[PDB]
Design an enzyme around this catalytic site. Structure first.
Site, PDB file in Angstrom:
ATOM      1  N   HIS A 119       0.838  -1.189   0.000  1.00 23.06           N
ATOM      2  CA  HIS A 119       0.000   0.000   0.000  1.00 23.06           C
ATOM      3  C   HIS A 119       0.876   1.243   0.000  1.00 23.06           C
ATOM      4  O   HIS A 119       1.940   1.248   0.627  1.00 23.06           O
ATOM      5  CB  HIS A 119      -0.912  -0.020   1.215  1.00 23.06           C
ATOM      6  CG  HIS A 119      -1.975   1.015   1.159  1.00 23.06           C
ATOM      7  ND1 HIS A 119      -3.211   0.780   0.585  1.00 23.06           N
ATOM      8  CD2 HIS A 119      -1.991   2.306   1.564  1.00 23.06           C
ATOM      9  CE1 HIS A 119      -3.943   1.874   0.651  1.00 23.06           C
ATOM     10  NE2 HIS A 119      -3.228   2.819   1.242  1.00 23.06           N
TER      11      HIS A 119
ATOM     12  N   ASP B 234      -3.763   9.516   3.287  1.00 18.62           N
ATOM     13  CA  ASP B 234      -4.033   8.189   2.772  1.00 18.62           C
ATOM     14  C   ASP B 234      -5.371   8.171   2.044  1.00 18.62           C
ATOM     15  O   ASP B 234      -6.377   8.596   2.610  1.00 18.62           O
ATOM     16  CB  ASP B 234      -4.041   7.152   3.876  1.00 18.62           C
ATOM     17  CG  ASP B 234      -4.219   5.776   3.311  1.00 18.62           C
ATOM     18  OD1 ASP B 234      -3.202   5.182   2.849  1.00 18.62           O
ATOM     19  OD2 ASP B 234      -5.392   5.318   3.267  1.00 18.62           O
TER      20      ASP B 234
ATOM     21  N   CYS C 204      -4.000   3.704  -4.907  1.00 21.87           N
ATOM     22  CA  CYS C 204      -3.166   4.209  -3.817  1.00 21.87           C
ATOM     23  C   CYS C 204      -2.106   5.168  -4.324  1.00 21.87           C
ATOM     24  O   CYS C 204      -1.855   6.210  -3.716  1.00 21.87           O
ATOM     25  CB  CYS C 204      -2.479   3.090  -3.056  1.00 21.87           C
ATOM     26  SG  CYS C 204      -1.775   1.768  -3.956  1.00 21.87           S
TER      27      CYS C 204
END
EC number: 3.4.22.-
Lengths: 187, 77
Positions: free
Chosen positions: A79, A96, A146
């Site tokens: 990630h 994030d 991501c």
């Protein structure tokens, strides 16, 4: 430039790899070199496992405390996320696109900054650091983007633009990043 | 003339090189791949956080005797 299988992680919904992230970071830092230092994706891994002594030489030619903005891509388990440091108000922010809340890394960065301040003799940076999980930011709606969100946050912050994008834009932001990397210049 | 270099990867073992200061590091990168049996494009070579390009040389990078090169493998997310 990059090899074609590195660039290929931008296609369709492929997961970005470290070559795209770190080369785009280098592109950003070459566009605004006086205000931004971009640490590559391996910095935080090496800071965690070896501490300040592991990364002390990464700034042998960089005065971090004259920059406005530090950009630290964070590779967590499969990630991509992002730490930013703004030096004017001394805020360490964690960005994030999937709602992740990883508390360890803002404190890894705060410890690094404190040690770097003692070692480079910049004690006006020993006090005052505050944290923030950045509110308010476009969130991904799939399990692949991501890395693209991270790089778009990076480009927005480096050029001081608002976060005027959403998930619907990401196919086209993938092809913009592709083009910028092939021409070795930001748009 | 020659400089000693340490190439250190995930296994923390030191691979020792003794190369000329003027030759391109592309060939150190090739040698190290061979030694560990993986393709060169699957490794990243860094000197003090700076990506080592194929055309870089120890002298151009200001490397000194027994300086450390770090090797990393690809990250995805």
């Amino acid at each position: 430039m990059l090899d074609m299988d590195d660039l290929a992680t931008l296609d369709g919904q492929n997961w970005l790899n470290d070559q795209v992230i770190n080369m785009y970071g280098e592109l950003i830092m070459d566009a605004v070199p006086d205000k931004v230092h971009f640490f590559n994706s391996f910095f935080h891994r090496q800071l965690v496992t070896k501490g300040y002594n592991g990364v002390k030489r990464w700034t042998k030619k960089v005065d971090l405390f004259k920059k406005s903005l530090l950009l630290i891509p964070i590779h967590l388990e499969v990630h991509w996320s992002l730490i930013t440091v703004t030096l004017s108000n001394r805020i360490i922010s964690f960005y994030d696109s999937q709602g992740i809340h990883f508390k360890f890394c803002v404190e890894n960065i705060r410890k690094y900054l404190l040690t770097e301040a003692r070692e480079k003799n910049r004690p006006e940076f020993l006090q005052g650091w505050q944290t923030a999980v950045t509110k308010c930011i476009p969130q991904q709606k799939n399990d692949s983007d991501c890395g693209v969100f991270v790089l778009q946050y990076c480009k927005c912050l480096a050029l001081e633009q608002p976060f005027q994008f959403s998930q619907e834009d990401m196919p086209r932001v993938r092809k913009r990043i592709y083009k910028e990397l092939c021409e070795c210049r930001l748009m | 003339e020659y400089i000693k270099l340490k190439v250190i990867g995930q296994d923390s073992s030191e691979i020792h090189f003794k190369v000329k200061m003027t030759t391109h590091l592309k060939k150190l990168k090739e040698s190290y791949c061979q030694r560990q049996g993986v393709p060169m494009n699957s490794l990243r070579f860094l000197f003090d956080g700076q990506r080592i390009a194929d055309n870089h040389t120890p002298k151009e990078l200001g490397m000194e005797e027994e300086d450390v090169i770090e090797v990393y493998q690809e990250q995805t997310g």
